[PDB]
Amino acid sequence: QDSLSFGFPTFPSDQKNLIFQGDAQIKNNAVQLTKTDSNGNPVASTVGRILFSAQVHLWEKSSSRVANFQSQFSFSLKSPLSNGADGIAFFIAPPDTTIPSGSGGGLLGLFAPGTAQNTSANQVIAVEFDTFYAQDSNTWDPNYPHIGIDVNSIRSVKTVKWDRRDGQSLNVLVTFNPSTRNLDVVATYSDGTRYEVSYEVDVRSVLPEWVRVGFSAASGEQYQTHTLESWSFTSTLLYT
Amino acid sequence: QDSLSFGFPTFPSDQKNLIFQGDAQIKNNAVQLTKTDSNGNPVASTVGRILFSAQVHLWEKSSSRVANFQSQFSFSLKSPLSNGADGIAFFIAPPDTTIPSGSGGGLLGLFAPGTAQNTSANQVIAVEFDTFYAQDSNTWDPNYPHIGIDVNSIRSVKTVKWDRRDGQSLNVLVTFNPSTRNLDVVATYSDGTRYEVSYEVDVRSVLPEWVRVGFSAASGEQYQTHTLESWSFTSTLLYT
Ligand SMILES: [Ca+2]
Ligand SMILES: [Ca+2]
Ligand SMILES: [Ca+2]
Ligand SMILES: [Ca+2]
Structure with a gap:
């Protein structure tokens, strides 16, 4: 289909269209x-x-069209520790994607240790909310919690300072405009505190025509809950 | 998901979210x-x-909600003869539905011969466009081409006289309002000729909470092409 949309205001235990990997559950x-x-x-x-479960038609070679998409979601993190880890991410990857061997901790369940920073060995676009930045293990991270845009590498193409608030829901809106090729991220807490980051990227040179979308999270020695509270998504192919 | 939507303006050969059964192909x-x-x-x-492929949440017992849905599509029938058979139908059924043994010809690929008219042995709602009504093989049909609403039986609970036009596309809108329980069908040809039929039905007592939607067609000894040209669908659980 040229267009697809779905919305989960909440996540009842009776699910039929979600693919669960690893320890994820309702x-x-x-x-x-x-x-x-x-x-x-x-x-x-x-x-x-x-x-x-349904595959998304991100772009179409034969017609020169690229999808305009929006993903709105909310989550909360909680931990009795002073340094909860490791973070949660919204991502887009090939339909057959599975959890890479040894991708725990700072790799967020998205990359393999051997190629985590090799942009030629991966096919993934992700928006991460990273809470663990120990300069001795996560050598690729800036020294503070942050929001990052990842393109085929755990070392974000860019990051912005972000504040972790235990037990508070963060609402996020991720959008992609095929005309300008801008991937925009806007996140807000209930008191109005706002965070914004944007990056220009041609998705056709990074991902295949059909993909799957979802979320990933992990915890190593340090831990915290990564709770996805709601999620809405829409995509439509447009001429460019 | 509480809401789901998808649209196929056309049907390119590269399909990922369609389940093909029998002889259907792009x-x-x-x-x-x-x-x-x-x-x-x-x-x-x-x-x-x-x-x-994605399952539709038609109703939810816990919250007592029922979905409001709409299905818009277009199709055309063509045959060297003048007695083209047997017809095409939009249907809703349990997720694991498959073509019943011996459901060809007038059974439209939806019912089995031995239980075609047993309402307690089936789980299906369908909107049929029936072009063949020979009283010897289709004893259940009125004696003229028609559009009908089928609820667990090949013998429609409601029908309206219809005209078959070789090679001309028919535009159809099927809607279900949970508030009134009315299933409405509106079909029109490009010149404005319009056909309408409706019936009151409680989907909760006929189908399970999760279902799949699609189309079925068949030709016995008499034949014609059953070409599906476009299709869009939307469903939203409402608190009525
Ligand atoms: Ca990190
Ligand atoms: Ca990071
Ligand atoms: Ca018939
Ligand atoms: Ca009939």
């Missing part, structure tokens, strides 16, 4: 990307991702 | 539900169907 009308014990407390060494 | 940017030869002419004894 609990209390929300998606818990990373594993939690019986008490709902976060645990270390966990990775999980979800993908919408 | 050809010339359209879906040919029934088999055709090399030159493009219809053949006898053929059945074919397509279904969208």
Whole structure:
């Protein structure tokens, strides 16, 4: 289809169109990307991702069209530790994508250690909300929590300073305009605090014609819950 | 998801979210539900169907919500003869539905011979465009071409006289309002000729909470092409 849209105001336990990978599962009308014990407390060494089952037609070679898409979502992070890790990400990748071997911790369940920074060995665009930046392990990160745009590498093409707020929902709007090739990110907390970051990128040179979209999160030695609360997505092919 | 929408202005050969059953296939940017030869002419004894891969949440027991949906599509029928058969139908059924054994000809690929008229043995709602009504083989049909609404039986609960026009596309709008429980059908030819039929039905007592939607067509000894040209669908769970 040239156009596709779906909306999850909440996530009831009875799901049919989501692909669960790793430890991801539904609990209390929300998606818990990373594993939690019986008490709902976060645990270390966990990775999980979800993908919408229907494939999205991102671009079409034969007609020279590229999709205009928007993804609106909300999530919250919680941890008794002073340094919850590692972060959550909205991503776009090939339909057959699976959790790479050894992609836990700072790799956010998106990249393999051996090629995490080799832009030629990957096909993925992601918007990350990174809370762990230890300069001895995450050598590619700026020294502070941040929002980053990733294109085929864990070392973001760009980042902006962001504040982690335990237990507070962050609303995010990610949009892509094929005319200007701008990928825009706008995130806000309930008190009005706003964060914005933008990057120009031609998706045709990075991703195949058909892709799947979803979320990924992970925790290494340090941990926190990564709770996806709602998600709406729309995409339509346009002439460019 | 509480809401789902998709639109196929045309049908390119590169499809990823369609389930093909029987003889259905993409050809010339359209879906040919029934088999055709090399030159493009219809053949006898053929059945074919397509279904969208993502499941639709028709109703939810917990919240007591029922979906409001709309399906818009266009198709054309062509035959060297004048007695083209058997017809095409838009249908809604359980996700694992498959072509019943011996459902060719007048059963439109939707019902099995032994239970075609047993309402307690089926789970399907369909809107049929029936062009063949010979009383010896289709004992359940009125004696003239028609559009009908089928609820768990090949014997329509409501029908309206219709005119078959070889080679001309018919534009159709099917809508279901959970507030009134009315299933309305409006079909029109480019010159303005309009046909209408409706029926009150409680989808909750006929179909499961999650379903799949698609089209079916068949040709017995008499034949004609059943070409699906475009299709758009939208559904939203409402609190009525
Ligand atoms: Ca990090
Ligand atoms: Ca980072
Ligand atoms: Ca008939
Ligand atoms: Ca009939």
